[PDB]
Amino acid sequence: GAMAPPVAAPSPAVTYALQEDVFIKCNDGRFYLGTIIDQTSDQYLIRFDDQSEQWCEPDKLRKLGGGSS
């Protein structure tokens, strides 16, 4: 989804910086910690600990230390 991913919350609008670790939820419910390598306005390319790169929507990403953005 773009801007409004399917969640139990309104339309998320969060941004992240590259080279930053964030937790990513997969549809199975598990969260995988990964490092952001690229961003778009709709998704963030996360390179996980397993070095896989996936475009994850902003709803899947959670900040490690609160985040000011």
- Is residue 62 within 8 Å of 31, Cβ to Cβ? yes
48, HSE (Cβ side, Cα atoms, 13 Å): 15
Domain housing 6: 1-69
Residues in the chain: 69
- Is residue 12 within 8 Å of 51, Cβ to Cβ? no
The residues facing 5 across adjacent strands are: none
**CATH, residue 37:** 2.30.30.140
Instruction: Indicate the SS3 state at residue 67.
Output: coil
Strand 61-62: give its sheet, edge to edge: 53-56, 44-48, 31-39, 21-25, 61-62
Is the C-alpha dihedral spanning 30, 31, 35, 38 positive or negative?
A: positive
Distance, CA of 57 to CA of 59 (rounded, Å): 5
| Nearest residue to 18 via CA among 39, 40, 32, 42 | 39
SS3 of the chain: helix, strand, coil, percent, to 5? 0, 35, 65
For residue 58, which amino acid is it?
Answer: P
Number of domains in the chain: 1
- Is residue 55 within 8 Å of 65, Cβ to Cβ? no
